[PDB]
Amino acid sequence: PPLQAVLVADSFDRRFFPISKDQPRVLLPLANVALIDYTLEFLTATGVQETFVFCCWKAAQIKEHLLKSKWCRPTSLNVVRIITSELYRSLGDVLRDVDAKALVRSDFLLVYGDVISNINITRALEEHRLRRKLEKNVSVMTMIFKESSPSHPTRCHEDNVVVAVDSTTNRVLHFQKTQGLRRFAFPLSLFQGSSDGVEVRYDLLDCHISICSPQVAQLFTDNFDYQTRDDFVRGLLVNEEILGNQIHMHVTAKEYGARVSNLHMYSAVCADVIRRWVYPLTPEANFTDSTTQSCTHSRHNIYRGPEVSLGHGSILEENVL
Amino acid sequence: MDDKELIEYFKSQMKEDPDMASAVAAIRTLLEFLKRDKGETIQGLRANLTSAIETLCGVDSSVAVSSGGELFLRFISLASLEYSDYSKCKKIMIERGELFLRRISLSRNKIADLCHTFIKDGATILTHAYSRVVLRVLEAAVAAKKRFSVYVTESQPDLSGKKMAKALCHLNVPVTVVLDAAVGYIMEKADLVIVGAEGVVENGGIINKIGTNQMAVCAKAQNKPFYVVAESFKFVRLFPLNQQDVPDKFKYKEEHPWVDYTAPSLITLLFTDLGVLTPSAVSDELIKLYL
Hints:
Chain B: It is found in: Cytoplasm, Cytosol. This is part of a larger assembly, with chains A and B. Chain A is an alpha/beta fold. Chain A has helices at 35-45, 59-66, 91-100, 122-133, 189-193, 215-221, 229-238, 263-273, and strands at residues 4-6, 50-52, 79-80, 115-116, 141-142, 144-146, 162-166, 172-176, 198-201, 211-212, 250-252, 258-259. In chain A, the strands form five sheets. In chain A, strands 1-2-3 form a three-stranded parallel β-sheet, with no helix packed on it. Chain A has a three-stranded antiparallel β-sheet with strand order 8-7-9. Chain B is built from ten helices and five strands. The chains are: A alpha/beta, B mainly alpha. Chains A and B meet through loops of A and loops of B.
């Protein structure tokens, strides 16, 4: 079957105020390019071709810029439908909405606004497939994540993640953030579930590249009380007595997917994408054929657009787009 | 028509134009003679031009002029002359001659926009003399809005580097006139050396003003890549093996050379309006082109 990806271009962590005044959040220029672009190049890289974007607040400017998208060309591989709906302000409603129009056929990969990534989902995508149809819908979600170390500037003061998981099928066992918790709390629910080894981790990123399955649109419609993905996962992790059909977690090792949220996160991800940490994606590859993004990569990570007329004796040590 | 006006005409041509390298002034005056030859023959004109070129060589001691004479002699009989009257020949001949003029004029611009993309930005360029072609290719690379410095030597016998500076700083480029004897010093701190040439030998190396070779050798030991520019006609069928071998019709004008030779082992990249080269390719090209 085709691989269709729901997508919302208004991450409701509405923190880029006042910056959100002039141009909306997603459209932001990180490295003189739209983040949403980065996301779309990602979607194309993992090879999905029917992407359903969504923007409620400021959808106008979104379409205004994305009409000339790298993937709004007729030659594109991705088809896009900016459903200009301004009712929801929580993803819950847009998921019940992709329920409300049977858009997702089956086995979709929902994604937040401005994930920076290079990840090939196909390994995951297929293992999801395996333990979902060689297991017949016992799954509902197979979280994907990226190994890291806590001290890195990827986990700003604001957001980290800590998670209990199994080690045999790698199914989720609990998910929770750690905004100032010198200790933690895990129930023996974990082990009265099974006596064959359980793992806790604090070295996964907030990758926010949840693979899912339209029965996720089910799990959102059948209960109108969820407003974010964390709502979803913790509700399903507590509602394991019946009708849980838990999440099958999975971590990568070689890629870089970060759902940029706050100005510090934008800082970190911009000055790591300049360092090519995500390559293929970097503006000298000019992946959006958009003209003025001709970036003549040069000595020692100094990038340089055309006609910069760089000043005499102006030293530039590194990473200067 | 006699040899007096020929030599003085070369002199006048070079005087009204110090900006025209001696070779092309020679070739010009040569075409001028061919015009007013007032002869009607084929070989009887070959003899005239050979004698005239001998005189010009005996006036100006440059390799450029005599070499250009050789090449002009070649490029008047390049294909079937279509010998019909020994007069219309002259017409078509001098036509090909003015075409030769055309290519010789184009030479500089060709080599400039051929090379000015070879200078990585922010490095020190170390020329050696008043090499018109070097000045032009630099001027180009500047016009492309780059950044780089200039160290120039001064090629002691006559002040050349002083002149090159006085004319280059007119382009507002960082310039520094080393004392040519000091090449071994600044050789540590410039990456690559563009050097003007005044004649290419048939194995790839070049012949050039007094200091070239020693600079050359320094700029190889330290692996600092070594460039050179010279347009077409300054190819020559002279194959020395030792610095004593270079003919003495060039070496003068107590006893001190003016030009000397560098083995092609050292020259790392040519520059010829025929295109980028590789000294052995200068050989191949010379045997082919010369004809």
